[PDB]
């Protein structure tokens, strides 16, 4: 996965999370191949928000 520097401060950072959801819909397989490298972004978002 191409690197994404997201601090996840403002609520609108959810734009990037939204991107990932679309990726698991439009290309479920390629997403499966880069899930994990994506989870590295998701645990930043999740640490910060929850």
């Amino acid at each position: 996965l191409k690197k994404i520097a997201e601090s996840f401060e403002d609520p609108s950072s959810i734009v990037v999370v939204l991107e990932f959801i679309l990726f698991a819909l439009f290309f479920p397989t390629e997403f499966n191949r880069i899930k994990g490298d994506i989870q590295n972004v998701l645990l930043l978002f999740f640490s910060r928000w929850y």
Binding site: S7, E9, D10, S47
Partner: protein, 50 residues
């Protein structure tokens, strides 16, 4: 670790401090926008510390 324990603790510090400043703001009849501004500056410091 995936997450610095130091940045985590500072973030909980700003959790407490931010709720203290929100308490102080609502008690002192402050406009919601200036509140959004102090809250945003606080998140900003949280990421800079991160």
């Amino acid at each position: 670790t995936v997450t610095n324990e130091f940045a985590s603790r500072f973030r909980t510090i700003v959790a407490t401090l931010a709720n203290v400043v929100n308490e102080r703001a609502v008690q002192d009849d402050m406009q919601k926008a200036t509140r959004s501004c102090t809250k945003q500056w606080l998140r900003h410091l949280e990421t800079q510390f991160d």
